[PDB]
Amino acid sequence: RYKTKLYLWRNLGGLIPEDMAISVTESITADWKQYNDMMSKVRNETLDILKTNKVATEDYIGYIAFAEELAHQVWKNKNSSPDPNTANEASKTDLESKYSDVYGLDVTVLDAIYNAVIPIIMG
């Protein structure tokens, strides 16, 4: 008899501790800041490479787009891959083919970008 109401204790809803909730939002904050810092590094280092190589301004979108697609594939390798290092070199090959074949981009300039983007995403 007294047992009937005791079941209601099991699944009863209640308040969420503020400190635990703040922990959730602080990790999200950390997420977009780390994202932005990584993005600014990749962008700024690519820009330096392009300046150094006296790349035409019409080709900036091509090289920037390359650096970004490479950085994204490298992030995926770091996470999903049991051997990120092997998949990175394969991503390099894949994207360098794509961007020189389709967009006429210079592979020695793409190699420079690669060497900048890798430590940014891996470290």
Ligand X SMILES: CCCCCCCCO[C@@H]1O[C@H](CO)[C@@H](O)[C@H](O)[C@H]1O
Return the number of the residue (26 or 111) whose C-beta is nearest ligand X.
26
In terms of Cα–Cα distance, which of 30, 35, 53, 44 is closest to 117?
Answer: 44
Burial of 26 (0-12, 13-18, 19+ CB in 10 A): exposed
If binding means CB under 6 A, how many residues of this protein chain bind ligand X?
3
* b/e sequence 75-93, b meaning 16+ C-beta within 10 Å: eebeeeeeebeebbeebbe
Question: Among residues 18 and 58, whose Cβ is nearest to ligand X?
Answer: 18
Between residues 20 and 56, which has the closer beta carbon with respect to ligand X? 20
Residues 6-35 that bind ligand X (CB under 6 A): 15, 17-18
Residue showing the smallest CB distance to ligand X in the complex: 18
Q: Which of 24/102 has CB closer to ligand X?
A: 24
Write down the least CB distance from residue 27 to ligand X, Å.
17
Q: How far apart are CA 108 and CA 114, in angstroms?
A: 10
- Tell me the closest approach of the beta carbon of residue 25 to ligand X, in angstroms: 14
Say if residues 122 and 75 touch (Cβ distance below 8 Å).
no
Which residues of this protein are in contact with ligand X, per CB under 6 A? 15, 17-18
